[PDB]
Amino acid sequence: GAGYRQYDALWLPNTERPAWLDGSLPGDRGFDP
Amino acid sequence: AGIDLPFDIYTLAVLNSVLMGXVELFRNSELDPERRCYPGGAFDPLNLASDDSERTQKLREAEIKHARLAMVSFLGYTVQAWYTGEGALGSLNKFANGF
Amino acid sequence: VEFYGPDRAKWLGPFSEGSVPSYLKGEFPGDYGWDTAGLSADPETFARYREIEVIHARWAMLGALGCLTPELLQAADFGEAAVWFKAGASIFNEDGLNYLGNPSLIHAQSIVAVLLTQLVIMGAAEAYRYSGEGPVETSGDSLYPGGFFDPLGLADDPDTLAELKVKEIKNGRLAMFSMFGFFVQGLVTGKSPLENLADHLAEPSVNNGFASATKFLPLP
Amino acid sequence: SQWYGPDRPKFLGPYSTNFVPSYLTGEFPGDYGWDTSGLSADPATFARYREIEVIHARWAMLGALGCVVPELLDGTNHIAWFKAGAEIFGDDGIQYLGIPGLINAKSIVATLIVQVVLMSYVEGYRVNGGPAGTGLDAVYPGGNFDPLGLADDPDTLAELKVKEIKNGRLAMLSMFGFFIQAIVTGEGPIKNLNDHLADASANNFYALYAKNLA
Amino acid sequence: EFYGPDRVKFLGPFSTPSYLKGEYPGDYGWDTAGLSADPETFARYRELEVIHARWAMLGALGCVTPELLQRNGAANFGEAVWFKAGAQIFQEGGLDYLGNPNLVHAQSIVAILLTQVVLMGLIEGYRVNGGPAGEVVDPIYPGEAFDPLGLADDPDTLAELKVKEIKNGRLAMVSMFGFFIQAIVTGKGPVQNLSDHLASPSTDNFYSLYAKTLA
Amino acid sequence: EWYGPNRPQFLGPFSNPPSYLKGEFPGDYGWDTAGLSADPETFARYRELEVIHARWAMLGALGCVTPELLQRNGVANFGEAVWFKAGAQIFQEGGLDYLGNPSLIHAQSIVAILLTQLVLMGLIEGYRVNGGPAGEGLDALYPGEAFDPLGLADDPDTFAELKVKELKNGRLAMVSMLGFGVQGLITRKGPIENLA
Ligand code: CLA
Ligand SMILES: CC1=C[C@H](O)CC(C)(C)[C@H]1/C=C/C(C)=C/C=C/C(C)=C/C=C/C=C(C)/C=C/C=C(C)/C=C/C1=C(C)C[C@H](O)CC1(C)C
Ligand SMILES: CC1=C[C@H](O)CC(C)(C)[C@H]1/C=C/C(C)=C/C=C/C(C)=C/C=C/C=C(C)/C=C/C=C(C)/C=C/C1=C(C)C[C@H](O)CC1(C)C
Numbered sequence: 004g005a006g007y008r009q010y011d012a013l014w015l016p017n018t019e020r021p022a023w024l025d026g027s028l029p030g031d032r033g034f035d036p
Numbered sequence: 037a038g039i040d041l042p043f044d045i046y047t048l049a050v051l052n053s054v055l056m057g058x059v060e061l062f063r064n065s066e067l068d069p070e071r072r073c074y075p076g077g078a079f080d081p082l083n084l085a086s087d088d089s090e091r092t093q094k095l096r097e098a099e100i101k102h103a104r105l106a107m108v109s110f111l112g113y114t115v116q117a118w119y120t121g122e123g124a125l126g127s128l129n130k131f132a133n134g135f
Numbered sequence: 136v137e138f139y140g141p142d143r144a145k146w147l148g149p150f151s152e153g154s155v156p157s158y159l160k161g162e163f164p165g166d167y168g169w170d171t172a173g174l175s176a177d178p179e180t181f182a183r184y185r186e187i188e189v190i191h192a193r194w195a196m197l198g199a200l201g202c203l204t205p206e207l208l209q210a211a212d213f214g215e216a217a218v219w220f221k222a223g224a225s226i227f228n229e230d231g232l233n234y235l236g237n238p239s240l241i242h243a244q245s246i247v248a249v250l251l252t253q254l255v256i257m258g259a260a261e262a263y264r265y266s267g268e269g270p271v272e273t274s275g276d277s278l279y280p281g282g283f284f285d286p287l288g289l290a291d292d293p294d295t296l297a298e299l300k301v302k303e304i305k306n307g308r309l310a311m312f313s314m315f316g317f318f319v320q321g322l323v324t325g326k327s328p329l330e331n332l333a334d335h336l337a338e339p340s341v342n343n344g345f346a347s348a349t350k351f352l353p354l355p
Numbered sequence: 356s357q358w359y360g361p362d363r364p365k366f367l368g369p370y371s372t373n374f375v376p377s378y379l380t381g382e383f384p385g386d387y388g389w390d391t392s393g394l395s396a397d398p399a400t401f402a403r404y405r406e407i408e409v410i411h412a413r414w415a416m417l418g419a420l421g422c423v424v425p426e427l428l429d430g431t432n433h434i435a436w437f438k439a440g441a442e443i444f445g446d447d448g449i450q451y452l453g454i455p456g457l458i459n460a461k462s463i464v465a466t467l468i469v470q471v472v473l474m475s476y477v478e479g480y481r482v483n484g485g486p487a488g489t490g491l492d493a494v495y496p497g498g499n500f501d502p503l504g505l506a507d508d509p510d511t512l513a514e515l516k517v518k519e520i521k522n523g524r525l526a527m528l529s530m531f532g533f534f535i536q537a538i539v540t541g542e543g544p545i546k547n548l549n550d551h552l553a554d555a556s557a558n559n560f561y562a563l564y565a566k567n568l569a
Numbered sequence: 570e571f572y573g574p575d576r577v578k579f580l581g582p583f584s585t586p587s588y589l590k591g592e593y594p595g596d597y598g599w600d601t602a603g604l605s606a607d608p609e610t611f612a613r614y615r616e617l618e619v620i621h622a623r624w625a626m627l628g629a630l631g632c633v634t635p636e637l638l639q640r641n642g643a644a645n646f647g648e649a650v651w652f653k654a655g656a657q658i659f660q661e662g663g664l665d666y667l668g669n670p671n672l673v674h675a676q677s678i679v680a681i682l683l684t685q686v687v688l689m690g691l692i693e694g695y696r697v698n699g700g701p702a703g704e705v706v707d708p709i710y711p712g713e714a715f716d717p718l719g720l721a722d723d724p725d726t727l728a729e730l731k732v733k734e735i736k737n738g739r740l741a742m743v744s745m746f747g748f749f750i751q752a753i754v755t756g757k758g759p760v761q762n763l764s765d766h767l768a769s770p771s772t773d774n775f776y777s778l779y780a781k782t783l784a
Numbered sequence: 785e786w787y788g789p790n791r792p793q794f795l796g797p798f799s800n801p802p803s804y805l806k807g808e809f810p811g812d813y814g815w816d817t818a819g820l821s822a823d824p825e826t827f828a829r830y831r832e833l834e835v836i837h838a839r840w841a842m843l844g845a846l847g848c849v850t851p852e853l854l855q856r857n858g859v860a861n862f863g864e865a866v867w868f869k870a871g872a873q874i875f876q877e878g879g880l881d882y883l884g885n886p887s888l889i890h891a892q893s894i895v896a897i898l899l900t901q902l903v904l905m906g907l908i909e910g911y912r913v914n915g916g917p918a919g920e921g922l923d924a925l926y927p928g929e930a931f932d933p934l935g936l937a938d939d940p941d942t943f944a945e946l947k948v949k950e951l952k953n954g955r956l957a958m959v960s961m962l963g964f965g966v967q968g969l970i971t972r973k974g975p976i977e978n979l980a
């Protein structure tokens with residue numbers, strides 16, 4: 004518990020996942036501009 | 037690998053077209069959308085990710101990340117060949133011998 | 136930063152909490168929690184190792200000071216005796232040990248006499264140290280006598296004494312590391328440490344430790 | 356199963372039925388009952404020695420493979436394991452597999468600093484725990500370090516442990532052999548094997564080097 | 570030290586405004602002109618000081634590094650000296666990063682300026698308002714996405730690191746000013762001046778060759 | 785005299801033995817400045833190692849000194865009298881002759897010597913460790929019986945005296961063997977040559 008930060012991770016530090024991408028698929032990063 | 041093949045280029049072209057057509061027609065025969073991506077069976081002889089668990093999800097994540105990385109890498113291959121006129125190792129050599 | 140208790144500085148920074156042995160409770164000076172081989176899991180062996188470490192640290196500080204000072208004073212002239220490892224055979228030369236250059240101070244010429252005198256005096260000293268009691272009125276602590284060897288009375292406050300203990304185990308350990316470096320450099324490059332420092336300062340890019348790397352290569 | 360308990364194989368065969376220390380019960384892998392120095396009487400020192408032995412075994416297997424492999428390749432000029440370090444000072448630097456433009460490492464301080472930082476971080480993570488796993492076993496963590504799940508069954512885990520520790524011990528012995536054989540002969544282990552195979556009676560230790568070793 | 574009422578002042582034992590209460594990092598109690606007598610103006614000045622410190626640290630590193638690389642025979646830049654490095658865009662082939670023709674190969678100054686203006690404006694608007702990299706809470710110490718390694722986790726370590734940042738930034742600002750006035754006076758590179766001074770400290774200095782020519 | 789608290793220590797009049805060193809075992813002079821024997825099991829293993837090393841050291845010292853002295857006494861011409869040069873005799877065209885007589889051994893093959901020594905030494909070591917034909921339920925350190933044909937060490941007092949003499953003679957032999965090694969390494973000559 005040292006030497007790093009504890010910190011779902013999306014393609015931007017502050018962004019929201021789209022409605023049609025619910026995160027169930029493997030590579031789902033919520034990336035669909 | 038420096039070994040001359042016993043086939044003619046016309047025969048090779050026809051064979052490539054026929055074999056690829058047969059393989060892709062076999063592939064298209066599936067109807068389940070999930071098994072259209074991960075057929076399993078004869079294509080998973082070692083039974084690594086053929087169940088429903090956390091171990092298969094990690095393997096699928098790794099596969100998709102490798103797929104994306106290789107796609108970008110081959111786009112880079114093509115663009116480098118267009119611009120500099122070199123291959124992959126050739127581009128590495130040209131970059132190294134330019135400092 | 137405190138050097139005692141469970142919240143003291145340790146040997147691995149943030150990663151130390153996962154490798155701190157149970158018996159290393161930080162009740163002694165220089166306790167950083169570094170024991171990965173379990174060599175001090177026995178309380179008696181821990182005390183013996185502490186004694187050996189402190190004595191070695193003191194001797195290493197003395198050795199580092201006595202290897203550094205004579206080269207700077209050369210205010211004097213020695214020639215081939217300036218180097219710390221090259222001064223051993225200076226007695227065998229038919230000039231005597233010209234202390235500070237004056238050939239009238241000790242004028243040592245013989246080996247057996249000085250050797251035997253050193254053996255007897257240091258045998259008496261080390262036997263008294265092992266006994267811990269004798270002609271001198273010490274405080275009874277073998278590691279920290281204090282009674283006679285502290286004429287300035289710097290060890291009077293227990294907390295100040297503990298801080299001094301931490302500081303001098305640390306100075307001693309730095310001296311041990313530097314003395315090991317002195318030995319290895321002497322074997323490898325065969326030059327005085329000051330000469331090595333000057334050569335490094337001349338061009339540090341090429342005059343580093345990896346320049347003399349292929350010299351140990353075993354040829355067929 | 357046969358590697359644990361009071362009936363495990365001993366390091367002296369039938370001649371060590373009664374020469375077994377009391378504390379070497381046999382619940383740990385690779386327990387052949389070789390402690391004829393009394394160096395593991397204390398359980399804490401025993402556990403620390405076990406961890407050191409496993410780590411050394413893994414490092415030695417990696418080192419043996421990485422000393423053997425570059426000598427067998429034409430691209431690397433069949434270089435010996437003890438001569439590959441100085442290639443960074445060559446006019447071409449270090450080029451992986453002999454292919455130009457692969458790495459082209461010419462600076463030694465840069466590689467040293469990178470190795471120091473990376474090894475520091477990974478060793479600290481191993482000792483204390485980190486992003487790759489927390490609260491796991493000291494020597495056999497698993498989890499992110501067992502992607503294929505080869506040791507889900509505890510019996511399979513024990514058998515693999517015995518196999519690993521034995522391969523590691525063999526690799527440690529082979530690495531010590533590499534060191535001594537490089538010191539004495541002055542040539543690579545693969546060249547020594549080839550010379551021995553060419554003429555076993557003539558090309559050996561006693562016939563060439565032992566006569567002038569003292 | 571460095572906090573509370575007993576911290577080290579800017580004159581040591583010879584040393585205070587009432588509004589400098591030893592709460593904010595890097596407060597040595599040196600405000601003689603009374604320019605920070607207003608709390609709002611004090612906050613604005615603190616923010617400008619921190620931003621200037623970070624920018625000056627980056628500038629000092631970027632002014633030292635290329636000339637150091639060039640003078641050691643590690644690269645062949647178009648113009649190693651920092652004040653002459655902006656004219657590389659007017660050379661024959663343009664600007665090449667580290668001297669490699671296949672790295673940047675910038676040729677047009679108009680495109681450089683337009684792209685820089687757009688990107689800098691977008692990111693500075695994000696900094697003052699909040700955008701893709703996070704939402705503004707602390708105007709100068711965001712953290713979260715800008716502290717991935719998590720070094721500013723413990724508040725005590727956070728305060729210590731803030732003090733260290735502000736002091737290294739002040740030193741960087743002083744060195745930036747020195748670099749500027751040396752360029753406007755000597756006309757040569759900074760590390761060049763350092764090497765010249767190290768060659769002959771007694772004879773090579775500002776007074777020996779430039780004090781009399783100033784006036 | 786040699787046992788109990790009345791025993792002399794390793795520092796003459798000064799005597800600060802450790803707590804665990806009670807002097808019951810032979811050759812206890814209270815020298816544990818490293819504290820290595822704080823555990824009884826490690827102490828016992830170290831005692832066994834010390835006695836075996838001592839015996840082997842005396843045997844090796846005698847085997848190192850006797851042939852070279854015999855050669856220098858004008859008795860027989862050895863192939864190489866120097867103790868650390870006996871291995872080069874097997875590579876001579878004349879082979880290995882015991883005392884120079886070609887009809888005694890005339891060994892030629894190093895491999896055969898290696899194999900024979902390996903099997904014999906392994907068998908006798910296993911017998912010593914576990915218990916073979918020469919007694920089974922005997923002491924590991926001092927089995928006696930077949931190993932004391934003269935029966936000198938029968939009563940407790942003579943047994944203890946002879947054990948102490950054994951241990952101190954073995955310690956002296958180990959010191960002498962180390963001196964042999966260092967002298968040979970530095971002088972590149974025989975030991976008796978250095979003595980004379
Ligand atoms: C245990 C630790 C260990 C250590 C410390 C070393 C240390 C070293 N190795 Mg060895 N090695 C080891 C284990 C080890 N090895 C093992 C297990 C193997 C078997 C795989 C090898 C096989 C090996 C080779 C084949 C080579 C070395 C070489 C080297 C040297 C530096 C190269 C370098 O680090 O690459 C930098 C780090 C890497 C991880 C590089 C990997 C990425 C490369 C570019 C990928 C190549 C694959 C790619 C698909 C292209 C190939 C296709 C080709 C036909 C075009 C250095 C002496 C090199 C040398 O020249 O030595 C004389 C060398 O050529 N090693
Ligand atoms: C058991 C017991 C018991 C009793 O009681 C006591 C006694 C007897 C003491 C004991 C014993 C012990 C032993 C024997 C041990 C051993 C060890 C070893 C040998 C190790 C090694 C070990 C070893 C090891 C690790 C090794 C390693 C290695 C490595 C990494 C390498 C690397 C490399 C490579 C790749 C290549 C390149 O080019 C170079 C380098 C970089 C160099
Ligand atoms: C006591 C104590 C205490 C504390 O606590 C700690 C301390 C201090 C650490 C300790 C100490 C210790 C010590 C000192 C030890 C030592 C040892 C030795 C030296 C040994 C040897 C040892 C030695 C030995 C065995 C030897 C052996 C030998 C031999 C066999 C030989 C053989 C041979 C011969 C015949 C001849 C030929 O030609 C050759 C050969 C083949 C070679």
Ligand SMILES: CC/C=C\C/C=C\C/C=C/CCCCCCCC(=O)O
Binds near residue numbers: 050
């Ligand atoms: C389904 C099959 C469809 C199309 C296949 C058609 C053609 C195959 C290609 C033939 C290439 C012939 C090239 C003849 C000249 C080669 C070069 C030379 O030898 O000079």
